[PDB]
From a paper:
Glycogen synthase kinase 3 beta (GSK-3β) is a serine-threonine kinase known for its ability to regulate glycogen synthesis and to play a critical role in many intracellular pathways, such as the signaling pathways involving insulin, growth factors, and neurothrophins (Wnt pathway and insulin pathway the most known). In contrast with most kinases, GSK-3β is constitutively active, being inhibited in response to a specific stimulus, and it can only act on a pre-phosphorylated substrate. The central role of GSK-3β in many intracellular pathways makes this enzyme an exciting and puzzling target for drug discovery. This widespread activity has also led to identifying GSK-3β dysregulation as responsible for the development of many diseases, such as Alzheimer’s disease (AD), bipolar disorder, diabetes, cardiovascular diseases, and cancer. In this work starting from a 19F NMR fragment screening, two fragments able to bind the ATP binding site of GSK-3β were identified and characterized through biophysical assays.
Out of seven identified homologous, two compounds, ARN1484 and ARN9133, showed a similar inhibitory activity (IC50) to G5 and G12 (38.1 µM and 27.2 µM, respectively). The 3D crystal structures of these compounds in complex with GSK-3β were solved. This analysis allowed us to putatively ascribe the selectivity of the compounds observed for GSK-3β to the formation of hydrogen bonding networks that are peculiar to the interaction of these two molecules with the protein.
Numbering used by the authors: 36 to 385
The structure:
């Protein structure tokens, strides 16, 4: 059995191609709709097809965003096409994406179940690549707004990480308000919990920090079934936020005061032999004041990632580390001077 569609390439000019695929499995299910796996007939390559209801009213924002993006650490939209079948008279948008086998979520949980933590080298590789993907999208003023381990795809052999699921992503424009019900629990920045609608891209940075801490800890750092419970956990670590910090997150001073707890020394939060650089980075990501958090690009240049810039660094399995230094001017525009740290001497050899 073989499906053949006429699809538009995600990048490049509108030059429709006849695409045929087979072995259609299922995955995903949820909010958006369905995700299938498939095998492209000629090349034999695996792809994921995300199928969602097309609005008719507006054009699909995820698609609009996907087509603008091209980066080694973001899933490639290979094709998109429309279809339906069945008793519906409703259009479905189908996004054909590179299939990447693992996710940070699944990996983390394997190590967690086995009472292990992921080797710090993998923590470095995954986090660096995430920050690059954020640096890139943020440069277009696009915030992901749902950074979490399930959205971080991994090829285990190459150590390559790819940000996915742009269903929540949106261009944040100074002055325009945005819904505060967007991020997934545990990874929500305080300003989101306080219902702020004037938030910036630094919510993604907070979320990234939550992922780092979690890979280090072996479990979510700020858990809770309610916002109340999450804030308690946040306060247990960061300490009680000052009236200044409180005004910084949500201007609209919700209505209350929290228990007055002092800052738990970040060193006492983590397993005893945790690298100090890792801990330092966390504290500079997980800050109350949104403007006080490192930028993605600033994070990449943090000393916690120095090992990745070492010329002799290899994967434990012997392979080379994947591309880490092929920055574009687009990607560096945040702060071009950082190139002198980000691009190590050996990467400039001729
Ligand atoms: C594409 N996203 C909307 S998603 O539904 O969250 N998507 C993450 C999952 C995904 N997407 C892509 N592109 N490749 C492999 C996988 C994947 C599916 C199942 C897995 F166990 C691991 C990875 C499915
Ligand atoms: Cl044509």
């Amino acid at each position: 059995k073989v499906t053949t569609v006429v699809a538009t390439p995600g990048q490049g000019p509108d030059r429709p191609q006849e695409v045929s695929y087979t072995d259609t499995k299922v995955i995903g299910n949820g909010s958006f709709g369905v995700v299938y796996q498939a095998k492209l007939c000629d090349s034999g390559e695996l792809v994921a097809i995300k199928k969602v209801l097309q609005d008719k009213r507006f054009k699909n924002r995820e698609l609009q965003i996907m087509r603008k993006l091209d980066h080694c650490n973001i899933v490639r939209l290979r094709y998109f096409f429309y279809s339906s079948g069945e008793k519906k008279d409703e259009v479905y948008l189908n996004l054909v994406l590179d299939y990447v086998p693992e996710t940070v979520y699944r990996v983390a949980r394997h190590y967690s179940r086995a009472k292990q933590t992921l080797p710090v080298i993998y923590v470095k590789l995954y986090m660096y690549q995430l920050f690059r993907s954020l640096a890139y999208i943020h440069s277009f003023g696009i915030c992901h707004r749902d950074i979490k381990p399930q959205n971080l795809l991994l090829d285990p052999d190459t150590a390559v990480l790819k940000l996915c699921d742009f269903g929540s992503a949106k261009q944040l424009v100074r002055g325009e308000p945005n819904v505060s019900y967007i991020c997934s629990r545990y990874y929500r920045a305080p300003e989101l919990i306080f219902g702020a609608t004037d938030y910036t891209s630094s919510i993604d940075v907070w979320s990234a920090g939550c992922v780092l801490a979690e890979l280090l800890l072996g479990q979510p750092i700020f858990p809770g079934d309610s916002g109340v419970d999450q804030l308690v956990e946040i306060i247990k670590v960061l300490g009680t936020p000052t009236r200044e910090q409180i005004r910084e997150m949500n201007p609209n001073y919700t209505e209350f005061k929290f228990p007055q707890i002092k800052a738990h020394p970040w060193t006492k939060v983590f397993r005893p032999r945790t690298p100090p650089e890792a801990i330092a980075l966390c504290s500079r990501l997980l800050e109350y004041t949104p403007t006080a958090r490192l930028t993605p690009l600033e994070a990449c240049a943090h000393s916690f990632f120095d090992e990745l810039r070492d010329p002799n660094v290899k994967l434990p399995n012997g392979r080379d580390t994947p591309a880490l230094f092929n920055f574009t001017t687009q990607e560096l525009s945040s702060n071009p001077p950082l190139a002198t740290i980000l691009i190590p001497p050996h990467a400039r050899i001729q």
